[PDB]
Amino acid sequence: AYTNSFTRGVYYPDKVFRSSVLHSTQDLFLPFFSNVTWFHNPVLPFNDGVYFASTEKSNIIRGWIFGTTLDSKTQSLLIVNNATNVVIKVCEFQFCNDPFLDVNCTFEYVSFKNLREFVFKNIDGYFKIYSKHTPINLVRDLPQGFSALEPLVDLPIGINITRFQTLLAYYVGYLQPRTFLLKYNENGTITDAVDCALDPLSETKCTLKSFTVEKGIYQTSNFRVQPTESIVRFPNITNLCPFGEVFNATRFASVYAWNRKRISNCVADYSVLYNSASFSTFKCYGVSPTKLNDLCFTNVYADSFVIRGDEVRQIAPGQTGKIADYNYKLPDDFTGCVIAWNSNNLDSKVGGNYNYRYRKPFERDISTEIYQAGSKPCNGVEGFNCYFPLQSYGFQPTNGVGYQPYRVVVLSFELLHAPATVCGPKKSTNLVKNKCVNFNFNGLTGTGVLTESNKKFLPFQQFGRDIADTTDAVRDPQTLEILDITPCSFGGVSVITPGTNTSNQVAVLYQGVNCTEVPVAIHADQLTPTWRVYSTGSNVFQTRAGCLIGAEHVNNSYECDIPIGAGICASYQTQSIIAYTMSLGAENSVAYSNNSIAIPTNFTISVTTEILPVSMTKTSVDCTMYICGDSTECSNLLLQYGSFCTQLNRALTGIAVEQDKNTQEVFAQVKQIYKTPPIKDFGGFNFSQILPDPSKSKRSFIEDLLFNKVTNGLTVLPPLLTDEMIAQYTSALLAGTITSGWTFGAGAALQIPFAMQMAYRFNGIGVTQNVLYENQKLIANQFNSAIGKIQDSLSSTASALGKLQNVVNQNAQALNTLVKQLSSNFGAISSVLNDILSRLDKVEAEVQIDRLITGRLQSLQTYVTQQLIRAAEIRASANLAATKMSECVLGQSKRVDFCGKGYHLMSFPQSAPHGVVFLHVTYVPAQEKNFTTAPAICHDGKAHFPREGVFVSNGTHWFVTQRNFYEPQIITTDNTFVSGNCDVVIGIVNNTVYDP
Amino acid sequence: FNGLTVLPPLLTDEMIAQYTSALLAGTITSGWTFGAGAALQIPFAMQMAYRFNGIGVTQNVLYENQKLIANQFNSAIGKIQDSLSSTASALGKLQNVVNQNAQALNTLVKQLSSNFGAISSVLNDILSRLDKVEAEVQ
Amino acid sequence: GTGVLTESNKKFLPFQQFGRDIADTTDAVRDPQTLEILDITPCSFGGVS
Amino acid sequence: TMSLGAENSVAYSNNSIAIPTNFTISVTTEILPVSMTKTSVDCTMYICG
Amino acid sequence: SALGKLQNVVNQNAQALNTLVKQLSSNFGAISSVLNDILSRLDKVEAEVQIDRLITGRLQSLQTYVTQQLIRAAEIRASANLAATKMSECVLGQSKRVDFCGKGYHLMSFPQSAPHGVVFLHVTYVPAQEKNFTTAPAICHDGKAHFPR
């Protein structure tokens, strides 16, 4: 019988306080929503540790036995409660299946409406116990909910437990290795958890380290099709190799005349030779002797001779001495083995066996040509300073060991190149095409898909290679057809989420994967590590970008919420996640004709917003303190690397000073600290929210929203201008802009009434200035209301300031990464430097320290190089901000869409963390009407054109009007100018042109 | 195929062609107005008079020469087709963005054939030929 | 370690012996002879200009 | 503490304008870099001499 | 001191090559920082293990130099594009972009050459000697409002 585990069985992983934090940890845990066995008893397996529970208030459940034999034959745990105490012992006990109530000992210790919970696990010889108590109402199943179990007991007793039983409603489950994300509150209790492998949303929560995720698409994983089967393809040789004639023959050669045997067309078994005790050495080079049976070769050459026992040291690559110089040399990149033994009884004899003698790589020459000891005419004949080239070994069996004869076999291997022809003893399999498989062609191992091919190998060619050396096609050794290899299908895995705030559903995209490969592979119905079973969630759909699982395809085309790729988007709708081809927008046939114009009859003022970065957090690094932790031994090694721990400080000093330049270039545009008048008769425009609030530093109201909505060896440094100095500059800029127009940008500020300044801002966009005064209250109300909406927009969402937030988040991520890279081993024995200094002699310790120096130096260069790139990216924004302040704030830019959308009027800066915010104010025309139009008018045969503005008719009368606001005027001469007669102009019309 | 991949662009080229078409259709029927607000239609020879004022040439100069001006424009777009049709090296900037990435990937892939001082550039050789304690070093 | 040990307000649970930072750096300890919680700070360092 | 510059109450009202009555032509230098030293290095001869 | 920008372009290239040349003298853990010592004192099997440390250290030194020059070249290109723009707009024209072609209302500018750079002489009108007046946005005549053209 079984029951759902829900979220039960989490326990405190370590005796560490952590608070207000989400922490990621790997341990033996009960997986969420697993099946727990139920009981009302037998012995049970213990496995890799147990979660245990019971509903109780009778207290019939009294203890446990843990062990292997449960009684007598070995030490076994007894854990019992007797109401006086909890009791533990480990004895070779003397009790039956149930010695309990009617309703050595090398260690011992002493200390329904409710449920008891426990966890038992056993690691490093320590047996550990965790616990909880709770009230409950539900008796019929485990209480669905959460509460972390806390440690009680931790004991060095070391028993190899494989079974347990309860001593006399109760429940059992098994722990398994998993990653969990845990939530610690302000008082450092665990209060929630995520089981990362459970589902795609749980992968996403663990990927982001968050218990909630926003709407979007997130990568969590990579998908690869697994090898379904294994193949061995070998030459089908029956013959076995002639090693007795190599190793055990009578005539092992004298060393200057060394013998070579070629081996070919046979199956070997090097393990038989390697396992033999007969050899005083079995040293090997580019192959380990354990691996030799798995390999295959074009040739083996056995080189054979007898030599004096102490001289065997010359038989290696790179050696020197008379045997190497004149008798037999190995090449200095020898691939194979040297095997030798004390052949004292075999090769020595009581006459001192004079049959043996000594005198480039694999040279042999038996020549009698004399060793001359000088430039004499020795002429090949013996004499003083003229000596025969061979000398005899005095091999008597009574010799001391270094003077006895030893036999030597050298095995030199020629690899698979041409068709392999000496081979290990391996079993060949059948060949299988089109599947993802492991394969082994003559010891050439790999994983992939095998198919037919059209590759015309020339008869000597055995396999093809790609640009990366990787084997691209193979001839099968048993049937000479050419097979293509191809790598098994793979891609990035991404989770589409509506926002956990909004829904729990998800869809999964297998990027670039064909759906036929997916739902019976690493996704579902086969070997499915972490990318767990749901072969369909309801629908499986092939997009251009990859296979998409669990989303509903739609034939409509909406706007895009979650973009997938190749014009596909997804969103959550009437409910399910849908997927569709996106629409670029509403289609609009513009109402064109050769004679019709639309003129706006009304406008809106609009206040937009634009946010720009201006400076990173400044930093400098004491690279000796960071790399070496103030250890003297490490500091002395770090001298050998020269100037690196100085050009790093020089680079970061360049970054640091440039931040104060960026801030000064953006804000210090103004020579004097202008201040606002006491009166506020700015024609009804209400700046109270953007001017300083003196009751606040003296920031504006909107600046106080912006400063709230954004929120070792490594030393941070302060900015030069303080946040109160930046607020003085944004105040001075704003006070100049209000009281004096652009004039404070061209030397001395000239005062002008604000309503007249706006009349000139209108006069810059081609709207005739009377249009402002005649609409002055309306315009002031539109502006005041628009400033009001900025407060609500900035109040509405945390996503409003994402640009400035990304300067903060990247600096924190970079520094945290640079700190966490202290803990990495880089292949050294430990990442804690004091281990290496304490556990090892200095000669070994240096090599380990040098890996940590190398890893930390490569980490620190990696950090500094990203700060250079990231600072260059911020400087492009600082130059843009200084430009927008020069043209928009200090002026009125005519550059289309530079200072906000619409025709530009003015803008106001407000300070913010690491950046600036501009409130660009723009005119937008808003209520158009169609009119008939003609490019000219003919009066007395003279063709008239308007001086400024355009001719229009309401269908009966003709007027001229300005291009951006309907205001019809009678066509007097003074609105117009003549040029020539009617006839050259297209579309000219007849009207009166009036003379004043 | 060595763990390298190429992802598709979000906007497919038949979507890009609808944006460049819309920008062009706005620019013909409505001048600059569709940047400043909702598009306002105007006759094209009347848009060109505003463009002439925008360079300080008086608008009567257009109408007094409209047939000539149209022919000069049409002729230039003819020469554009012959130039682009003729000279494949004209797109040298874009073609370098293609070529530079091809060399970047080819270098990254070819580096898998380097030894860096190991016994072999091919990882499965080492794993076939050597036992663990030595294979780690390589 | 090394640092300026200080008296602190931290509220460790009975089984917890020491505290860690957001970046996993050890930064508070229970004194094993008097079960109040201390706060650990590295000894001061800085560039000399 | 650095000074950002002299403070200035602009003499604003809803009915006062200031207009200039003279001018200066002024000539201002601006300096921009355009190119580095064109440099080349033999990576065989530097590393291996 | 006006030319501090151009002189700093000279100084950074001088410091970069000095740093690259100094690093030839660093051991990086080899028995000597002079390659012919290794080749004259040691036989090849030993020598290659020492030489490989110099090759590694000198190569990491050289990649560090080339990467900082790639970044500095892009940082100069941003200035070359700005100078090319100021020459097209300020010299070949009269820019209305406020504070672009020197402070004040821009009239014209002249180029002068300088080693590794360019110097612009921006000529500008700056108003002076201002007087207060009373002002009003419009004037009534015969009950109709008037505004200045």
Ligand SMILES: *[C@@H]1O[C@H](CO)[C@@H](O[C@@H]2O[C@H](CO)[C@@H](O)[C@H](O)[C@H]2NC(C)=O)[C@H](O)[C@H]1NC(C)=O
């Ligand atoms: C070919 O012949 C030459 C002699 O003419 C051989 O030279 C010997 O090479 C070894 C190198 O290990 C030296 O120690 C000897 O001193 C050389 N001999 C003389 C007389 O100088 C050469 O090794 C031969 N090569 C082959 C492959 O057989």
Ligand SMILES: *[C@@H]1O[C@H](CO)[C@@H](O[C@@H]2O[C@H](CO)[C@@H](O)[C@H](O)[C@H]2NC(C)=O)[C@H](O)[C@H]1NC(C)=O
């Ligand atoms: C121009 O648009 C504005 C709104 O942006 C119009 O003002 C509104 O007019 C209606 C009556 O027609 C009132 O109910 C609203 O309270 C007005 N709003 C404001 C902010 O005052 C204005 O009437 C339009 N002008 C013309 C000539 O149609």
Ligand SMILES: *[C@@H]1O[C@H](CO)[C@@H](O[C@@H]2O[C@H](CO)[C@@H](O)[C@H](O)[C@H]2NC(C)=O)[C@H](O)[C@H]1NC(C)=O
């Ligand atoms: C300028 O606008 C602000 C709001 O943006 C006005 O301040 C509000 O005024 C009323 C009436 O005195 C108070 O009830 C509110 O509490 C004020 N709001 C805040 C947030 O303080 C201000 O009165 C306007 N002033 C002028 C001259 O128009």
Ligand SMILES: *[C@@H]1O[C@H](CO)[C@@H](O[C@@H]2O[C@H](CO)[C@@H](O)[C@H](O)[C@H]2NC(C)=O)[C@H](O)[C@H]1NC(C)=O
């Ligand atoms: C075109 O505009 C003219 C002038 O605004 C309009 O003519 C006026 O029409 C009203 C009645 O709607 C008469 O009371 C006025 O006496 C007319 N004035 C003049 C100068 O004729 C005319 O109605 C408009 N036509 C259309 C088709 O809208």
Ligand SMILES: *[C@@H]1O[C@H](CO)[C@@H](O[C@@H]2O[C@H](CO)[C@@H](O)[C@H](O)[C@H]2NC(C)=O)[C@H](O)[C@H]1NC(C)=O
């Ligand atoms: C504008 O009005 C004039 C008359 O005032 C029109 O000119 C006449 O057009 C007819 C038809 O082409 C000719 O037969 C007459 O000889 C013309 N008379 C004169 C005095 O030129 C003219 O066609 C009208 N224009 C438009 C565009 O309708």
Ligand SMILES: *[C@@H]1O[C@H](CO)[C@@H](O[C@@H]2O[C@H](CO)[C@@H](O)[C@H](O)[C@H]2NC(C)=O)[C@H](O)[C@H]1NC(C)=O
């Ligand atoms: C202005 O220059 C254009 C050429 O750029 C001249 O246009 C040509 O004029 C001749 C007659 O002189 C016609 O045969 C051609 O067909 C015209 N070319 C085109 C493209 O139409 C124009 O005549 C010149 N105008 C003046 C006043 O000199």
Ligand SMILES: *[C@@H]1O[C@H](CO)[C@@H](O)[C@H](O)[C@H]1NC(C)=O
């Ligand atoms: C396993 O658990 C699920 C609920 O999570 C349940 O439907 C299923 O029947 C259980 N299977 C067994 C064999 O207990």
Ligand SMILES: *[C@@H]1O[C@H](CO)[C@@H](O)[C@H](O)[C@H]1NC(C)=O
């Ligand atoms: C409980 O066990 C202890 C020894 O562990 C023993 O002294 C005590 O008498 C027991 N209590 C009862 C009620 O039997």
Ligand SMILES: *[C@@H]1O[C@H](CO)[C@@H](O)[C@H](O)[C@H]1NC(C)=O
């Ligand atoms: C007692 O322990 C020793 C080892 O310490 C072991 O040899 C012996 O068999 C044990 N006897 C019992 C009864 O467990």
Ligand SMILES: *[C@@H]1O[C@H](CO)[C@@H](O)[C@H](O)[C@H]1NC(C)=O
């Ligand atoms: C556990 O098993 C090992 C052999 O696998 C044995 O050497 C050891 O003594 C056992 N320890 C205990 C306490 O049972």
Ligand SMILES: *[C@@H]1O[C@H](CO)[C@@H](O)[C@H](O)[C@H]1NC(C)=O
């Ligand atoms: C945290 O502990 C304090 C006492 O140390 C207590 O006042 C407070 O209510 C606790 N808060 C939570 C969220 O447990």
Ligand SMILES: *[C@@H]1O[C@H](CO)[C@@H](O)[C@H](O)[C@H]1NC(C)=O
């Ligand atoms: C060599 O001979 C001995 C017996 O003299 C035998 O044990 C050994 O296996 C033989 N080895 C080979 C390779 O024949």
Ligand SMILES: *[C@@H]1O[C@H](CO)[C@@H](O)[C@H](O)[C@H]1NC(C)=O
């Ligand atoms: C060996 O290969 C040949 C050629 O394909 C085949 O005819 C023969 O049956 C094979 N023999 C064995 C024992 O595999």
Ligand SMILES: *[C@@H]1O[C@H](CO)[C@@H](O)[C@H](O)[C@H]1NC(C)=O
């Ligand atoms: C989820 O977001 C929507 C707005 O997109 C909001 O209305 C809703 O209240 C949010 N869900 C929760 C649990 O508050």
Ligand SMILES: *[C@@H]1O[C@H](CO)[C@@H](O)[C@H](O)[C@H]1NC(C)=O
């Ligand atoms: C996916 O694979 C099947 C064969 O398994 C093939 O018929 C289909 O055309 C493929 N589709 C794509 C888009 O690759």
Ligand SMILES: *[C@@H]1O[C@H](CO)[C@@H](O)[C@H](O)[C@H]1NC(C)=O
């Ligand atoms: C969507 O279009 C396909 C053909 O392109 C069709 O098979 C499908 O039935 C359509 N769906 C609906 C709801 O009409």
